[PDB]
Each structure stands twice: as C-alpha cells, then as structure tokens.
Design a protein around this ligand. Sequence first.
Ligand code: B6A
Length: 445
Amino acid sequence: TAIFSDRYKGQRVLGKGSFGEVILCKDKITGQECAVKVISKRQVKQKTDKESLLREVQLLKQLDHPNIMKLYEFFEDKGYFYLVGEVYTGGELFDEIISRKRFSEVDAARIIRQVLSGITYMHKNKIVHRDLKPENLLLESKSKDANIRIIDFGLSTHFEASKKMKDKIGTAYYIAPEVLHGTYDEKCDVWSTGVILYILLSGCPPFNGANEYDILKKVEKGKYTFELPQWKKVSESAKDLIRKMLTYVPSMRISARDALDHEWIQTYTKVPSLDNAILNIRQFQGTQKLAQAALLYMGSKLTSQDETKELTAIFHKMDKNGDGQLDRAELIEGYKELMRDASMLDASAVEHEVDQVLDIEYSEFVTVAMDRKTLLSRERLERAFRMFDSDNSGKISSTELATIFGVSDVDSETWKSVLSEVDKNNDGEVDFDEFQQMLLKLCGN
Ligand SMILES: Nc1nc2ccc(C(=O)c3ccccc3)cc2n1CC1CCNCC1
C-alpha cells in the first residue's frame, strides 16, 4: 500500500465539485501540478464494492481522449479516496461563453461536437456519466481555440450523490427522466447533452420551474417547446438534433455516435450571432452562482458556529493551567484534534494555517482563525451579488429574490417572513447588507 501525502502536497483549494473538494496539488519530486478530488467516506456512501471500484479506476487510467479528463492516480486511506487528475485552467464552459460579444451556431456546434466526441469514446468503453451538466465541462486552457474536458465520468456509478441542496443546484435541469425512475443506460448522457445544447442556442433550460421538484416534474413529463422568440433564429436541423436527443424513450433516442453524424454537426463545424441567447445564459449563470453562493455562505456560517465552540472546548480542556493561554505546539495539537479539512492534507498543512493565524490567548486565536473564514465566505457572496446586479443598482428586487430562493430551495413563506423581520418598510428590494442579513436569519442567526 502507498500513501497520498508521501507523493503530493497541497498548493491551494480550487473548488467544490460533486462528491468532494478539488485541491490543486504538486508532486514532491517531479513538480507536476494535478487536480485532486478528495472524497470524504464519512459523507459519501459507496454504491459498489472495493473490487469493482479498483477495476473501473484501473480502466479509467488507461483511457485517453482529448475531451475527457486524464486520470493519473487513485489513493485510498481510512477516511478518504483521492482521485488525481490533470488540472485545467480555462474554467467552466459557460463562464467563458458569457464573456463574449458574439456566439453563433458554429460556436455551439463545435462545443457540442467535442462533448459528443468525449461521450462516444466513453460509451465505447462502457462508462456512463449520468450527471453531465455545464459545471462538468472545463476548457483546457485560457487560450482561444481550446478543448473542452469533461470531468467526473464514471464516478456516479460508484458513489452516492449528496441529497443536500448546496450540492444539487443545477442538477435537476440536466437529469434524464429514466434516471429518475431507476432503469437507465448510456443514453442518459445523450439526453443531458441535449439539454445543454438547448440552453446553448436559447439560454433557457428546456425543463424549468420555481424549485427543484417543479423542475423534476417537467422533466419526468418530458415535454418542451421551441416557442420562445429566439428559436426563430436557430436552424431547423439544430431543432431536429435537439428533438432526437431529448426523445423520451431511451431506445428511440439517438446515440452519441449517431449524433456526431447528424446533419447539424456535419454542416455547422466543417452565421448570425445569437445575441438574445447570450444575454439569457448570462442571466441564468449569475442566478445559479448567486444561489450557490447563498447556500455556501449559510453553510460556512453553520460550520463556523460548530467549529468555534468545538475548538474552544478543545483548548479549554488542553489548558491545564486555567491561564486562558496555550503554547504553539498545543494550538497545533488542538487544531489537529479539531480535524480528528480539504486543505489540511497533513500535519505540515495545519502548521502553516496555525502560523498564518498567529502572523498567547487561545480565545483570540479562535476568533481570528474562524473570523478569517467568516470574512473569506462573505466576500464570495458579495462578488456573486455584484455579478448578479448587472445594472449596478445595488439592489435585488422581490421577483429576483424569488427566482434566487427558488433555485436555492428556500420555501417562499420562509424567506418572505425573513424579509419582513429584517426591514419593515422595505419597498420590495434589498441591498447587499439586507440580503446577507436575510441569509443569516435563514441559518438560525
Ligand atoms: N481547474 C480545475 N481543473 C480541474 C480538473 C479536474 C477537476 C475535478 O473535479 C476532478 C479531479 C480529479 C478527478 C475527478 C474530478 C477539477 C478541476 N479544476 C477546478 C474546478 C474548475 C471549475 N471550477 C470548480 C473547480
């Protein structure tokens, strides 16, 4: 057996994908950078045995396609799995798209030919994604004509998805109806890609609703339209491909490979800009990211409540003196003890964090060590609020809050009630401090 931190050290956290946090790490000998997804066993159940996971891992390491994340290594210890893959710098596809003056079917066809090409390859090797969505499409580099790299292929088969809403935002729109009901195969990826295509050419989800369950209700019924005025600008062959990919019965649904041969992919890769679709995607994306940011802020405030009190009790018990003061090594031992932590991969990781907080009285260390994380979490929320507020009015209206909280799965009576307690007179709009106050009251503060 071989240990992960013998070989890799953490550089810095990258984000929270499905199943766990992704950490930028560096090989301590060759200096190679890698994106390590760390799966916490204690919060992510397995669907399969160890025998079956080690086999898929062995296979995934051998596979190689320019539109699929390269997986280098797999580690496991008592408490976690470590998936070590190549790191990409171009960001999520949709964030790159919203920063464009123009976007035509030629851009959409090129994007989707890549996605279908990755999928086709994977299905040939009997690997299904199931959870394909825009968050899982990364651009390989910051440069112009760069490859899309699909992440997380094969994982849904071996791990149970979170049922917490901070992990579910923007999954409902893309899931294939047959996955909802239990009997599904590789055709579910074609469906998901079909929904992405739809959104690329109109900027609106084909199945949409006020909340998660309403979205799933629309998907399960399977009915959508091309009524929206901006479809008047999309070719018929594009609509024709969408129809085949969003075909309800999976055996009647076009395959990945066959979609690559479809007339639309054939024509539009080998031309007006969809101006309306871009403005729609830009609004969609801000909305999703602000809802995500809200939920993560609420979560971090609750973790902070938890971890503040726990560290205090640890440092109290450790202070044999009653001095209200601890040594450096003891602050490290009690901080290590707090971990019983994506960044804190080893004892050396923690020492840096302890030394950052210092750069005496344990009660002060506790405030700062958390207050850092508390202020750190606020700023991500602020940025998303600014981004959402695209006309720089400084406010979010009632209608917008309803869209935002609906995506966040906060009951309408519950947030409206919270709004009233924050500002009485109110005037139907909230500024940033009001928004933040509402979220504090939505996590018992
Ligand atoms: N920049 C970058 N390149 C990445 C490559 C892969 C991943 C993974 O989520 C991953 C890594 C290993 C195994 C399975 C998934 C994650 C990667 N990231 C960080 C993402 C980039 C998009 N925003 C959320 C964090």
